[model samples]
Target: HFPGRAPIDAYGNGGFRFADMSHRGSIICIPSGIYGIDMTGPVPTQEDISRVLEESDQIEVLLIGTGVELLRLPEELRVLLWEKRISSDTMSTGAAVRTFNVLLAEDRAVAALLFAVE
Candidate 1:
Protein backbone atom coordinates (compact mmCIF):
# COMPACT_ATOMS: atom_id res chain seq x y z
CA HIS A 1 0.00 0.00 0.00
CA PHE A 2 2.93 2.34 0.51
CA PRO A 3 5.56 1.92 -2.16
CA GLY A 4 5.74 -1.85 -2.38
CA ARG A 5 7.44 -3.32 0.73
CA ALA A 6 9.34 -0.77 2.72
CA PRO A 7 10.48 -1.38 6.30
CA ILE A 8 7.91 -0.10 8.74
CA ASP A 9 9.81 3.10 9.63
CA ALA A 10 8.17 3.48 13.00
CA TYR A 11 5.16 2.22 14.88
CA GLY A 12 3.20 3.74 17.73
CA ASN A 13 0.78 6.52 18.57
CA GLY A 14 -1.96 4.41 17.03
CA GLY A 15 -0.34 4.04 13.64
CA PHE A 16 2.70 3.00 11.58
CA ARG A 17 5.09 4.94 9.35
CA PHE A 18 6.57 3.38 6.21
CA ALA A 19 7.74 4.45 2.83
CA ASP A 20 7.48 8.06 4.05
CA MET A 21 3.83 7.48 4.96
CA SER A 22 1.87 6.49 8.02
CA HIS A 23 -1.32 4.49 8.44
CA ARG A 24 -3.86 3.83 11.15
CA GLY A 25 -5.56 0.58 12.22
CA SER A 26 -3.93 -2.76 11.37
CA ILE A 27 -2.10 -3.90 8.27
CA ILE A 28 -1.20 -6.97 6.22
CA CYS A 29 2.20 -7.03 4.54
CA ILE A 30 2.78 -9.61 1.87
CA PRO A 31 5.44 -10.03 -0.78
CA SER A 32 3.24 -8.13 -3.19
CA GLY A 33 2.60 -5.13 -0.93
CA ILE A 34 1.09 -3.84 2.28
CA TYR A 35 -2.66 -3.52 2.77
CA GLY A 36 -4.93 -2.36 5.57
CA ILE A 37 -6.81 -4.95 7.60
CA ASP A 38 -9.27 -5.15 10.47
CA MET A 39 -8.78 -7.76 13.18
CA THR A 40 -11.39 -8.54 15.80
CA GLY A 41 -9.48 -10.71 18.25
CA PRO A 42 -6.12 -11.16 19.92
CA VAL A 43 -5.34 -14.10 17.71
CA PRO A 44 -6.44 -14.15 14.14
CA THR A 45 -9.12 -16.50 12.96
CA GLN A 46 -9.07 -18.19 9.59
CA GLU A 47 -11.01 -15.37 8.04
CA ASP A 48 -8.75 -12.74 9.60
CA ILE A 49 -5.91 -14.25 7.58
CA SER A 50 -7.81 -14.74 4.37
CA ARG A 51 -5.55 -12.37 2.51
CA VAL A 52 -2.49 -14.31 3.58
CA LEU A 53 -4.08 -17.50 2.36
CA GLU A 54 -4.28 -16.05 -1.13
CA GLU A 55 -0.52 -15.60 -1.15
CA SER A 56 0.45 -18.44 1.13
CA ASP A 57 2.26 -20.14 -1.68
CA GLN A 58 4.61 -17.22 -2.06
CA ILE A 59 5.24 -16.92 1.67
CA GLU A 60 7.52 -19.15 3.71
CA VAL A 61 6.66 -17.69 7.07
CA LEU A 62 3.82 -15.56 8.40
CA LEU A 63 4.38 -13.30 11.39
CA ILE A 64 1.42 -12.19 13.43
CA GLY A 65 1.98 -8.93 15.30
CA THR A 66 -0.19 -9.20 18.39
CA GLY A 67 -0.02 -5.47 19.12
CA VAL A 68 0.03 -4.69 22.84
CA GLU A 69 -1.98 -7.76 23.66
CA LEU A 70 1.02 -10.08 23.11
CA LEU A 71 -0.61 -13.22 21.79
CA ARG A 72 0.19 -16.09 19.51
CA LEU A 73 -1.54 -17.82 16.66
CA PRO A 74 -4.15 -20.34 17.76
CA GLU A 75 -3.69 -24.06 17.21
CA GLU A 76 -6.13 -24.10 14.36
CA LEU A 77 -4.54 -21.10 12.73
CA ARG A 78 -1.09 -22.65 12.95
CA VAL A 79 -2.29 -25.96 11.61
CA LEU A 80 -4.17 -24.22 8.86
CA LEU A 81 -1.05 -22.47 7.65
CA TRP A 82 1.00 -25.62 7.97
CA GLU A 83 -1.59 -27.35 5.89
CA LYS A 84 -0.69 -24.78 3.25
CA ARG A 85 3.03 -25.25 4.01
CA ILE A 86 3.62 -21.84 5.56
CA SER A 87 5.26 -21.71 8.99
CA SER A 88 4.26 -18.94 11.36
CA ASP A 89 5.22 -17.05 14.52
CA THR A 90 3.68 -14.55 16.92
CA MET A 91 5.14 -11.71 18.98
CA SER A 92 4.41 -8.25 20.33
CA THR A 93 3.98 -5.52 17.73
CA GLY A 94 7.29 -3.95 18.67
CA ALA A 95 9.33 -7.09 18.08
CA ALA A 96 7.31 -8.26 15.14
CA VAL A 97 7.77 -5.01 13.26
CA ARG A 98 11.51 -5.03 13.75
CA THR A 99 11.75 -8.68 12.83
CA PHE A 100 9.65 -8.20 9.74
CA ASN A 101 11.95 -5.50 8.42
CA VAL A 102 15.08 -7.59 8.87
CA LEU A 103 13.49 -10.65 7.35
CA LEU A 104 12.23 -8.52 4.49
CA ALA A 105 15.74 -7.23 3.92
CA GLU A 106 17.02 -10.80 3.85
CA ASP A 107 14.60 -11.32 0.96
CA ARG A 108 13.08 -14.44 2.38
CA ALA A 109 9.51 -15.30 1.52
CA VAL A 110 8.09 -13.50 4.53
CA ALA A 111 4.82 -11.76 5.37
CA ALA A 112 3.36 -10.03 8.42
CA LEU A 113 -0.19 -9.35 9.52
CA LEU A 114 0.23 -6.66 12.17
CA PHE A 115 -1.96 -4.81 14.58
CA ALA A 116 -1.30 -1.12 15.21
CA VAL A 117 -0.76 0.17 18.71
CA GLU A 118 0.03 3.27 20.71
Candidate 2:
Protein backbone atom coordinates (compact mmCIF):
# COMPACT_ATOMS: atom_id res chain seq x y z
CA HIS A 1 0.00 0.00 0.00
CA PHE A 2 1.08 3.61 -0.46
CA PRO A 3 2.15 5.95 2.20
CA GLY A 4 1.29 9.25 0.56
CA ARG A 5 1.63 8.03 -3.05
CA ALA A 6 4.80 6.08 -2.38
CA PRO A 7 3.53 2.55 -1.85
CA ILE A 8 4.93 1.05 1.31
CA ASP A 9 5.36 -2.62 2.09
CA ALA A 10 3.56 -3.29 5.31
CA TYR A 11 1.41 -6.44 5.78
CA GLY A 12 4.22 -8.56 4.24
CA ASN A 13 1.72 -10.71 2.38
CA GLY A 14 -0.31 -11.58 5.44
CA GLY A 15 -2.94 -10.04 3.28
CA PHE A 16 -4.57 -6.66 3.64
CA ARG A 17 -8.07 -5.29 3.35
CA PHE A 18 -8.76 -1.73 4.39
CA ALA A 19 -8.25 0.15 7.58
CA ASP A 20 -8.40 3.78 6.73
CA MET A 21 -5.07 3.84 4.97
CA SER A 22 -6.25 7.02 3.29
CA HIS A 23 -3.11 6.95 1.22
CA ARG A 24 -2.56 3.44 -0.06
CA GLY A 25 -3.97 0.61 -2.11
CA SER A 26 -3.24 -3.01 -2.96
CA ILE A 27 -2.00 -4.78 -6.02
CA ILE A 28 -3.26 -8.06 -7.43
CA CYS A 29 -1.58 -10.23 -10.02
CA ILE A 30 -3.55 -12.37 -12.40
CA PRO A 31 -2.48 -14.88 -15.01
CA SER A 32 -2.06 -13.94 -18.67
CA GLY A 33 -0.29 -10.88 -17.34
CA ILE A 34 -3.65 -9.61 -16.17
CA TYR A 35 -3.43 -7.38 -13.14
CA GLY A 36 -6.31 -5.92 -11.13
CA ILE A 37 -6.34 -2.29 -10.07
CA ASP A 38 -8.94 0.05 -8.64
CA MET A 39 -10.03 3.42 -9.92
CA THR A 40 -11.66 6.24 -8.06
CA GLY A 41 -14.33 8.69 -9.32
CA PRO A 42 -16.93 8.40 -12.00
CA VAL A 43 -17.96 5.56 -14.26
CA PRO A 44 -16.08 5.01 -17.49
CA THR A 45 -17.02 7.25 -20.37
CA GLN A 46 -17.88 6.25 -23.94
CA GLU A 47 -14.36 6.77 -25.20
CA ASP A 48 -12.99 4.71 -22.35
CA ILE A 49 -15.47 1.99 -23.23
CA SER A 50 -14.48 2.09 -26.88
CA ARG A 51 -10.79 2.00 -26.17
CA VAL A 52 -11.21 -1.11 -24.05
CA LEU A 53 -13.51 -2.81 -26.54
CA GLU A 54 -11.01 -2.20 -29.33
CA GLU A 55 -8.68 -4.52 -27.50
CA SER A 56 -11.33 -7.20 -26.91
CA ASP A 57 -10.07 -9.47 -29.63
CA GLN A 58 -6.74 -9.62 -27.84
CA ILE A 59 -8.55 -10.32 -24.60
CA GLU A 60 -9.98 -13.77 -24.07
CA VAL A 61 -12.47 -12.46 -21.56
CA LEU A 62 -13.04 -8.88 -20.46
CA LEU A 63 -13.42 -7.94 -16.83
CA ILE A 64 -14.61 -4.67 -15.33
CA GLY A 65 -12.38 -3.52 -12.52
CA THR A 66 -14.76 -1.61 -10.34
CA GLY A 67 -13.10 -0.51 -7.15
CA VAL A 68 -15.56 -1.03 -4.28
CA GLU A 69 -18.70 -1.16 -6.31
CA LEU A 70 -20.24 -3.79 -8.51
CA LEU A 71 -20.33 -1.29 -11.31
CA ARG A 72 -22.93 -1.70 -13.96
CA LEU A 73 -21.73 -2.51 -17.44
CA PRO A 74 -22.42 0.25 -19.89
CA GLU A 75 -25.93 -0.64 -21.12
CA GLU A 76 -26.94 -0.81 -24.80
CA LEU A 77 -23.39 -1.56 -25.88
CA ARG A 78 -22.98 -4.20 -23.24
CA VAL A 79 -26.07 -5.99 -24.42
CA LEU A 80 -24.89 -5.65 -27.98
CA LEU A 81 -21.61 -7.32 -27.16
CA TRP A 82 -23.39 -10.04 -25.25
CA GLU A 83 -25.41 -10.78 -28.35
CA LYS A 84 -22.15 -11.07 -30.23
CA ARG A 85 -20.89 -13.79 -27.84
CA ILE A 86 -18.17 -11.71 -26.24
CA SER A 87 -17.83 -12.73 -22.62
CA SER A 88 -17.58 -9.46 -20.73
CA ASP A 89 -17.65 -9.67 -16.99
CA THR A 90 -17.55 -7.14 -14.18
CA MET A 91 -16.74 -7.34 -10.49
CA SER A 92 -14.38 -5.90 -7.95
CA THR A 93 -10.84 -5.88 -9.32
CA GLY A 94 -9.55 -8.74 -7.20
CA ALA A 95 -12.50 -10.99 -7.94
CA ALA A 96 -12.20 -10.19 -11.61
CA VAL A 97 -8.56 -11.21 -11.67
CA ARG A 98 -9.15 -14.38 -9.69
CA THR A 99 -12.04 -15.35 -11.92
CA PHE A 100 -9.91 -14.66 -14.96
CA ASN A 101 -7.21 -16.99 -13.67
CA VAL A 102 -9.76 -19.74 -13.12
CA LEU A 103 -11.23 -19.32 -16.57
CA LEU A 104 -7.77 -19.18 -18.12
CA ALA A 105 -6.85 -22.46 -16.45
CA GLU A 106 -9.94 -23.93 -18.02
CA ASP A 107 -8.73 -22.75 -21.41
CA ARG A 108 -11.33 -20.06 -21.70
CA ALA A 109 -10.97 -16.61 -23.20
CA VAL A 110 -10.45 -14.13 -20.37
CA ALA A 111 -9.50 -10.57 -19.53
CA ALA A 112 -9.40 -8.73 -16.24
CA LEU A 113 -9.96 -5.24 -14.87
CA LEU A 114 -7.16 -3.17 -13.43
CA PHE A 115 -9.07 -0.01 -12.84
CA ALA A 116 -7.60 2.91 -10.99
CA VAL A 117 -8.25 3.34 -7.26
CA GLU A 118 -7.43 6.70 -5.86
Candidate 3:
Protein backbone atom coordinates (compact mmCIF):
# COMPACT_ATOMS: atom_id res chain seq x y z
CA HIS A 1 0.00 0.00 0.00
CA PHE A 2 1.08 3.55 -0.65
CA PRO A 3 1.87 5.55 2.45
CA GLY A 4 2.10 8.69 0.34
CA ARG A 5 1.00 10.02 -3.06
CA ALA A 6 1.64 8.04 -6.21
CA PRO A 7 0.10 8.14 -9.66
CA ILE A 8 -2.54 5.48 -10.21
CA ASP A 9 -1.14 2.79 -12.42
CA ALA A 10 -4.34 0.84 -12.97
CA TYR A 11 -7.85 0.42 -11.66
CA GLY A 12 -10.23 -2.49 -12.10
CA ASN A 13 -11.47 -5.62 -10.40
CA GLY A 14 -12.79 -3.45 -7.59
CA GLY A 15 -9.39 -2.00 -6.70
CA PHE A 16 -6.57 0.36 -7.68
CA ARG A 17 -2.91 -0.38 -8.20
CA PHE A 18 -0.12 2.13 -7.62
CA ALA A 19 3.28 2.59 -6.10
CA ASP A 20 4.01 -1.08 -6.46
CA MET A 21 1.00 -1.95 -4.34
CA SER A 22 -2.76 -2.30 -4.56
CA HIS A 23 -5.73 -1.37 -2.41
CA ARG A 24 -9.11 -3.03 -2.84
CA GLY A 25 -11.78 -0.42 -2.17
CA SER A 26 -12.74 3.16 -2.69
CA ILE A 27 -9.86 5.61 -2.28
CA ILE A 28 -8.97 9.22 -1.76
CA CYS A 29 -6.18 10.52 -3.95
CA ILE A 30 -4.49 13.66 -2.76
CA PRO A 31 -1.61 15.57 -4.22
CA SER A 32 0.55 13.66 -1.82
CA GLY A 33 -0.92 10.36 -3.15
CA ILE A 34 -3.56 7.75 -2.43
CA TYR A 35 -5.21 6.38 0.68
CA GLY A 36 -7.98 3.87 1.26
CA ILE A 37 -11.34 5.46 2.01
CA ASP A 38 -14.11 3.91 4.06
CA MET A 39 -17.11 4.92 2.03
CA THR A 40 -19.88 2.59 3.11
CA GLY A 41 -22.73 4.08 1.13
CA PRO A 42 -23.79 5.13 -2.35
CA VAL A 43 -22.96 8.70 -1.39
CA PRO A 44 -20.16 10.15 0.66
CA THR A 45 -20.33 11.59 4.14
CA GLN A 46 -18.16 14.36 5.58
CA GLU A 47 -16.20 11.79 7.50
CA ASP A 48 -15.30 10.11 4.24
CA ILE A 49 -13.44 13.25 3.25
CA SER A 50 -12.10 14.35 6.59
CA ARG A 51 -8.63 13.68 5.34
CA VAL A 52 -9.23 16.08 2.46
CA LEU A 53 -10.48 18.70 4.89
CA GLU A 54 -7.34 18.26 6.90
CA GLU A 55 -5.30 18.98 3.81
CA SER A 56 -7.51 21.59 2.25
CA ASP A 57 -4.89 24.26 2.25
CA GLN A 58 -2.75 22.09 0.02
CA ILE A 59 -5.49 21.38 -2.47
CA GLU A 60 -6.94 23.72 -5.05
CA VAL A 61 -9.43 21.32 -6.59
CA LEU A 62 -11.18 18.17 -5.44
CA LEU A 63 -12.73 15.54 -7.70
CA ILE A 64 -15.55 13.33 -6.48
CA GLY A 65 -16.25 10.11 -8.33
CA THR A 66 -19.69 8.64 -7.88
CA GLY A 67 -19.48 5.08 -9.13
CA VAL A 68 -20.85 4.77 -12.68
CA GLU A 69 -22.81 8.02 -12.69
CA LEU A 70 -22.21 11.57 -11.62
CA LEU A 71 -23.92 12.67 -8.45
CA ARG A 72 -23.99 15.90 -6.53
CA LEU A 73 -22.15 16.24 -3.29
CA PRO A 74 -24.13 16.94 -0.14
CA GLU A 75 -24.74 20.66 0.31
CA GLU A 76 -22.99 20.73 3.64
CA LEU A 77 -19.96 19.06 2.20
CA ARG A 78 -19.88 21.49 -0.72
CA VAL A 79 -20.09 24.41 1.68
CA LEU A 80 -17.26 23.08 3.75
CA LEU A 81 -15.07 22.79 0.70
CA TRP A 82 -16.11 26.22 -0.49
CA GLU A 83 -15.18 27.67 2.86
CA LYS A 84 -11.77 26.17 2.42
CA ARG A 85 -11.44 27.71 -1.07
CA ILE A 86 -11.48 24.32 -2.72
CA SER A 87 -13.23 23.95 -6.03
CA SER A 88 -14.92 20.62 -6.56
CA ASP A 89 -16.25 18.69 -9.52
CA THR A 90 -18.28 15.49 -9.61
CA MET A 91 -18.15 12.84 -12.34
CA SER A 92 -18.26 9.16 -13.01
CA THR A 93 -15.48 7.20 -11.30
CA GLY A 94 -13.77 6.43 -14.59
CA ALA A 95 -13.75 10.06 -15.68
CA ALA A 96 -12.56 11.27 -12.34
CA VAL A 97 -9.70 8.82 -12.38
CA ARG A 98 -8.68 9.91 -15.84
CA THR A 99 -8.92 13.58 -15.00
CA PHE A 100 -6.99 13.09 -11.81
CA ASN A 101 -4.16 11.46 -13.72
CA VAL A 102 -4.02 14.21 -16.32
CA LEU A 103 -4.05 16.97 -13.75
CA LEU A 104 -1.48 15.13 -11.70
CA ALA A 105 0.79 14.80 -14.72
CA GLU A 106 0.48 18.53 -15.25
CA ASP A 107 1.47 18.91 -11.58
CA ARG A 108 -1.64 20.77 -10.57
CA ALA A 109 -2.72 20.78 -6.93
CA VAL A 110 -5.49 18.21 -7.29
CA ALA A 111 -7.16 15.56 -5.20
CA ALA A 112 -9.82 12.93 -5.88
CA LEU A 113 -12.28 10.72 -3.99
CA LEU A 114 -13.02 7.73 -6.18
CA PHE A 115 -15.62 5.05 -5.63
CA ALA A 116 -14.82 1.57 -6.78
CA VAL A 117 -16.44 0.46 -10.04
CA GLU A 118 -17.71 -2.95 -11.06
Candidate 3 lDDT trough over 10 residues, lowest sum: 1-10
| Per-residue C-alpha lDDT of model 1 across residues 22-104, encoded as one tens digit per residue | 88878889877888887765577788788788888899998888988678678888888988898889999888899999999
Model 3: residue 110 alpha-carbon error in angstroms: 0.4
The true-versus-predicted C-alpha distance at residue 44 of model 2, in Å, is 2.6
Which residue window of length 10 is worst by lDDT in model 2? 3-12
Name the lDDT value of residue 21 in candidate 1: 85
lDDT of 2 by residue, 41-104 (tens): 4254444445345555554456665655678877875865575466776676556545655665
RMSD of 1: 1.4
Cα error, candidate 2, residue 69 (Å): 1.8
Candidate 1 residue spans exceeding 4 A from truth: none
Worst 10 residues of 1 by lDDT: 36-45
lDDT of 3 by residue, 25-72 (tens): 999987556888877754788898888889998999998888888998
- Give the better candidate number (2 or 3) by TM-score: 3
